[PDB]
RNA sequence: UCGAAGGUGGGAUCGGCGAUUGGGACGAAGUCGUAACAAGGUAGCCGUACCGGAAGGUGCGGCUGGAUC
RNA sequence: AGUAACUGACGCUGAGGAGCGAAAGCGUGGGGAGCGAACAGGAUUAGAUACCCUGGUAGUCCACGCCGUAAACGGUGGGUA
RNA sequence: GUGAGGGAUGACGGCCUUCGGGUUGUAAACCUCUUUCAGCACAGACGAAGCGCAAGUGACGGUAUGUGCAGAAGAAGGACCGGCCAACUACGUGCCAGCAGCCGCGGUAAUACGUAGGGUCCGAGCGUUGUCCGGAAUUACUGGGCGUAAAGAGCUCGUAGGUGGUUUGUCGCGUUGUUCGUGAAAACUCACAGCUUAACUGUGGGCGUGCGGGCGAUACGGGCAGACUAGAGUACUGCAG
RNA sequence: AUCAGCUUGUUGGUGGGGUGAUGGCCUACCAAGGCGACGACGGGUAGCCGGCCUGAGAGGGUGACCGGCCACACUGGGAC
């Protein structure tokens, strides 16, 4: 089961000395909605084999989102393409606040609580490019504190601590529940 | 002020039922009109629209009503999809709704306002009543002896008693305990979209 | 000219870091110094200890790359600054990398760390973050 | 820009380009229509629109465009003046509201009638 | 003694109008023209002085955001 | 650049202010081969008040003052690590 | 508040049709129900441990509020439907008559003009208009740039100001170190409670983000009270232009 | 600053009067300066504040009602 959406269609045109030849663009981003991201930016003269095509590359090209429970782990300053996208965690249940294309692939990340802000070249795909760098730029508690040669209760905040215990119980009851 | 026109309208046009036994739905499951079955473009506010229309058109509430229902969902601590939920399951008409005294939101609210029900030994006609823990619902003499209320409680064979609701007797007292959660309640729809909506 | 021997220290540090080099010299102080030795009590830096040159003092500093050769730190900035010194509160302690970074604060005990600065209730100014 | 300058000079916040001064801020004015006539548009759009020229308690020359496809105003006439730009013409920035003073909404309209001021048929 | 109002006389600011004139923008379409964009048929541009209905031309100095060899 | 004898916080940038500054232009008084705005002719064009040719007045030179602008470009201020 | 439960492979009539039919539609006529609030009557407050040594004192109001009577009986409209932006077809004139917040729409067959239906949004309010913030990171302290898009002044010397190369010493005037001490009322935020719930207000907290003095600290961030030199300058010898 | 100097009881001292209270609040006599590029004097606008709207915040806009002050009562003055 994967998460499919459109973010915008184009009407791409090439010149010859008879006249125009006009061309079909898309991009589309592929989730499984529990933290695996791709995304596919795909190129035809019809839209079948535009989607297509950007479905191709989407699942050649995937990407891992390290997310605590349901929410990011810490706020990330995405500075990528020629736009800003800055993403922070939130309050559980607030939702997913960002634009279009920030909307459709943290919808196919999973997510359910983040804020975001687009401070510009408000382009999808420029946007699009601005998250994923933010998401790459994360950095999770275990690995971090494995790097600074430091404990776990040493590094992260017991806030935190016990909101991935919260996590890693619900986590087993649903394992359990499904196994039931 | 509440809505006059048909109830099979919005199940029609917007795509899923409300009411749940609408026949004319599941014969003609696209929208009225002479061109329902034209294809229309994607859209996120198409969708987050969608289910707030859903949401509203299905519990019979007002638009302001709602708004301040979502602005009290949003300054409560808690989370604000699930006070959101209580905070319209609240509603008297609802809570009378799903513990089986009414046959649909619509009967329980026109009951409601011509008052046939007492809470806490006090009169009360508001359809938007606020139930709150641990309080008791009761049912006056005058309506137990109107005949639709007696076909309601006979013939009450509808979606099974909640965990916070539940019935005593033959008198048809409702009582509430906790604030159920989400996962129990397991009502249609997505609140996200909605929070979402409003947060735009 | 030579107008800010913290901020130099921290770029010069974070360049070697993008470098990918191992050791760098830096004219010795005390607050370079104590600097280090909080880097060194965080874990953020390998290892630390002061030579003598041809005039004073200097100080040489380790990084710390592990088996797979990304760097150990992300990025620094300073954020009190001659002109613009920016101070907290008891109260209004700042956040940095959502709690998972490190805050210099100059409090009453002197340069330490956020967390336990806000255990102390003690605060100060901030000197940089260090994520 | 460094912190000195800041200190020393401070930053001036953007005037705001106000539109439509012959209101002075205020929604709407009565005025009398000195001359009725019509213009040409721009290139893009050719047309015969309708304008009058009124004259405003704020002692303010300024056209006005009549919408609708009838209107019965003539020189000396008692008008109702709101706040409406119009692109074709070029130098017409208010709409005449239809319903009030001495205008009367144009007759057969069904739809949109509360914009151009059509009471209802029984 | 002070003292408001009033009147003498000349300076500043805000203005309103004013023959006529100078300049600007929008119309659309017409005459006069070939200016610039390709070595645009005299390489372009900048500062400056002169000249000519007009775009411009020339002198001096500076740049290549100039193509060949 | 080397020796590093000595001073021992004198360093940096710098609003307003002040000094220098391509060519052309102006005053006074000299100089003035070549070059060359302006202006005459000759030539082309339907048309040339331009491009071309023959001439040549300011200027181009000198001294004292002036104006203080250039695509004054590395179209990038300086200093430090 | 202007209703309903059930009611047909879905009765008129309108609009399209490919002339098969589809639309308005569970809508409607229908069989039953309670009839809120207005309508007609009865009772009828508290607001007053109040004032008087008097015999009474309520404008509101004979209202609010209860108790009965009759009847679905008295009750819905406004914008939008080219893309932005949830909502399309037909009919009538074609660079005319006209729309419009940006792009922009009619030069005989318009989902953008006008009329019809149909659907969407909202609702006792519906839109237009004007002012203010946000998106506008579009005045960028957090949080912008200066090669070509807007920008490095022509370049130096340098006054006032702004900022300083090490470590050798007090007072604590930049400063945090804790406590008592103000923060009127009202408002905001948290919980409680009352008017049948509704606005409304009834009580007690809490909130009240700044500033006053007494007591306790010295790591950075300044003056002040003494020494050294990694910046800088000088000194000795040469150097090319 | 497309407003660079302003001021002559003006500035300061002493002695008198003055007022509930000190004081160029008023007078006389002595000296020449004070305020000024860390924006004076000039020009336009406007009651200030707890608050309201918007914005996550910073900030921006604003002064409805209520409430804390301020100033006025057709215009200008004066006093019991
Ligand atoms: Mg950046
Ligand atoms: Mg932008
Ligand atoms: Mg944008
Ligand atoms: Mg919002
Ligand atoms: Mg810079
Ligand atoms: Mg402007
Ligand atoms: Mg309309
Ligand atoms: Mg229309
Ligand atoms: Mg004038
Ligand atoms: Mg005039
Ligand atoms: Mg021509
Ligand atoms: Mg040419
Ligand atoms: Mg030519
Ligand atoms: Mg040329
Ligand atoms: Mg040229
Ligand atoms: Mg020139
Ligand atoms: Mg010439
Ligand atoms: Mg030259
Ligand atoms: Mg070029
Ligand atoms: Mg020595
Ligand atoms: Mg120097
Ligand atoms: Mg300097
Ligand atoms: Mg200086
Ligand atoms: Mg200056
Ligand atoms: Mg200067
Ligand atoms: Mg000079
Ligand atoms: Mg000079
Ligand atoms: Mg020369
Ligand atoms: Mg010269
Ligand atoms: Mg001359
Ligand atoms: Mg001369
Ligand atoms: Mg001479
Ligand atoms: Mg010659
Ligand atoms: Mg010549
Ligand atoms: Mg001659
Ligand atoms: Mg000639
Ligand atoms: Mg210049
Ligand atoms: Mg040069
Ligand atoms: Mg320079
Ligand atoms: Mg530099
Ligand atoms: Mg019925
Ligand atoms: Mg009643
Ligand atoms: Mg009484
Ligand atoms: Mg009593
Ligand atoms: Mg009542
Ligand atoms: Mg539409
Ligand atoms: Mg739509
Ligand atoms: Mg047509
Ligand atoms: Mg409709
Ligand atoms: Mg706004
Ligand atoms: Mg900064
Ligand atoms: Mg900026
Ligand atoms: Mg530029
Ligand atoms: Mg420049
Ligand atoms: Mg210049
Ligand atoms: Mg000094
Ligand atoms: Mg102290
Ligand atoms: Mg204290
Ligand atoms: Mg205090
Ligand atoms: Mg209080
Ligand atoms: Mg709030
Ligand atoms: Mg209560
Ligand atoms: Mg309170
Ligand atoms: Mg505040
Ligand atoms: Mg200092
Ligand atoms: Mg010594
Ligand atoms: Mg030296
Ligand atoms: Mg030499
Ligand atoms: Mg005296
Ligand atoms: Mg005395
Ligand atoms: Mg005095
Ligand atoms: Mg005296
Ligand atoms: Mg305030
Ligand atoms: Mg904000
Ligand atoms: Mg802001
Ligand atoms: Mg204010
Ligand atoms: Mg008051
Ligand atoms: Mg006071
Ligand atoms: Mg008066
Ligand atoms: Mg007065």
């Known amino acids: ?171 087993a009851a649903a394992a359990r529940e499904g196994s039931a | ?94 809570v009378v709704y799903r513990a089986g005294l009414a046959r649909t939101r619509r009967m329980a609210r026109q009951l409601v306002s011509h008052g046939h029900f007492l809470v806490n030994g006090v009169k009360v006609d508001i359809p938007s009543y606020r139930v709150s823990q641990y309080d008791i619902i009761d049912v006056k ?49 997505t609140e996200q979209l909605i929070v979402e909506l409003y947060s735009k | 000219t030579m107008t800010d021997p913290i901020a130099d220290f921290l770029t010069r540090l974070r360049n070697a870091n993008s470098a990918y080099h191992d050791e760098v010299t830096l004219p010795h102080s005390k607050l370079k110094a104590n600097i280090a030795e909080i880097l ?26 592990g088996p797979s050769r990304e760097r150990s730190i992300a990025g620094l900035r300073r954020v009190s600054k001659p002109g613009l010194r920016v101070y907290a509160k008891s109260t209004n302690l700042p956040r940095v990398l959502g709690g998972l970074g490190v805050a210099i604060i100059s409090t009453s005990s002197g340069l330490l760390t956020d967390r336990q600065a806000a255990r102390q209730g003690v605060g100060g100014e901030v000197l940089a973050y260090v994520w | 820009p460094t912190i000195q300058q800041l200190v020393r000079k401070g930053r001036r916040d953007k005037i705001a380009k106000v539109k439509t001064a012959a209101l002075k801020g205020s929604p709407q004015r009565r005025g009398v229509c000195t001359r009725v006539y019509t213009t040409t548009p721009k290139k893009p759009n050719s047309a015969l629109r309708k304008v009058a020229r009124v004259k405003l308690t704020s002692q303010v020359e300024v056209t006005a465009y009549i919408p609708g496809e009838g209107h019965n105003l003539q020189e000396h006439s008692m008008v109702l003046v709101r706040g409406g730009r119009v692109k074709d013409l070029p130098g017409v920035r208010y709409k005449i509201i239809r319903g009030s003073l001495d205008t009367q909404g144009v007759k057969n309209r069904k739809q949109a009638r509360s914009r151009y001021g059509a009471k209802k048929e029984k």
């Open chain 1, 1 to 171: 089961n994967y998460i499919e959406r459109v973010v915008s269609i184009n009407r791409v045109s090439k010149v010859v000395k008879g006249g125009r030849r006009f061309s079909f663009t898309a991009l589309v981003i592929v989730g499984d909605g529990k933290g695996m991201v791709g995304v596919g930016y795909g190129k035809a003269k019809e839209v079948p084999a535009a989607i297509a095509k950007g479905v191709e590359e989407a699942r050649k090209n995937f990407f891992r989102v390290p997310l605590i429970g349901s929410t990011i782990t810490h706020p990330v300053q995405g500075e990528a393409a020629a736009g800003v996208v800055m993403l922070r965690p939130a309050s559980p249940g607030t939702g997913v606040i960002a634009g279009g294309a920030a909307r459709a692939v943290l919808e196919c990340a999973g997510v359910h609580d983040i804020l975001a802000k687009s401070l510009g070249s408000d382009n999808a795909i420029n946007v699009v490019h601005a998250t994923v760098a933010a998401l790459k730029l994360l950095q999770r508690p275990e690995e971090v504190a494995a790097r600074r040669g430091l404990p776990i209760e040493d590094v992260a905040p017991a806030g935190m601590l016990k909101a991935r215990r919260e996590s890693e119980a619900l986590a």
């Open chain 2, 1 to 94: 002020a509440r809505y006059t026109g048909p109830a099979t309208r919005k199940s029609r046009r917007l795509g899923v039922d409300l009411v749940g036994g609408d026949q004319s739905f599941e014969k003609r499951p696209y929208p009225p009109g002479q061109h329902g079955r034209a294809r229309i473009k994607e859209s996120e506010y198409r969708q987050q629209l969608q289910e707030k229309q859903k949401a509203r058109f299905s519990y019979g509430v007002m638009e302001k009503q709602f708004r301040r229902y979502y602005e009290e969902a949003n300054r409560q601590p808690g989370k604000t999809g699930d006070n959101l939920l209580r905070i319209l399951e609240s509603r008297l008409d609802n």
């Open chain 2, 141 to 189: 003499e005058k309506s137990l002896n109107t005949l639709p209320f007696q076909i309601a409680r006979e013939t009450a064979g509808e979606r099974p008693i909640p965990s916070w609701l539940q019935v005593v007797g033959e008198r048809q007292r409702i009582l509430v305990h906790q604030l159920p959660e989400r996962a129990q309640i397991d009502v249609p729809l």
């Open chain 3, 40 to 65: 060194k009590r965080e874990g953020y830096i390998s290892d630390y200890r002061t030579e003598d040159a041809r005039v004073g003092k200097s100080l040489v500093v380790q990084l710390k790359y």
